[PDB]
Design a binder for this molecule. Structure first.
Ligand code: SF4
Length: 73
C-alpha cells in the first residue's frame, strides 16, 4: 500500500537524506535510492519502493540511501 515512510536507521544504515550518510564509509555522493539498482518505483511525494524484503516493508525516500545500495551503472 502507501507503506509508512522509512525511519532514519530503519535497517542497513538507511538515511532519509542521502547526504546524511556522508559519515558512512560505504557512502559516495550522488547515490540516491532513486538511482539505486534495487530501486522499485516512485510511489508518491519523493517516496518509492525498494526491491529488498528487508526494506520494502517501509516506503523509502527517493532521496534516501542505504548500505545495501548498488549503482545502476
Ligand atoms: S537498496 Fe537502499 S539505497 Fe537502494 S533503493 Fe533500497 S533503500 Fe534505497
Amino acid at each position: 500500500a502507501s507503506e509508512p515512510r522509512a525511519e532514519d536507521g530503519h535497517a542497513h544504515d538507511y538515511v532519509n537524506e542521502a547526504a546524511d550518510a556522508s559519515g558512512h564509509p560505504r557512502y559516495q555522493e550522488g547515490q540516491l535510492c532513486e538511482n539505486c539498482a534495487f530501486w522499485g518505483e516512485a510511489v508518491q511525494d519523493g517516496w518509492g519502493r525498494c526491491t529488498h524484503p528487508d526494506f520494502d516493508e517501509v516506503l523509502v525516500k527517493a532521496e534516501g540511501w542505504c548500505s545495501v545500495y548498488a549503482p545502476a551503472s
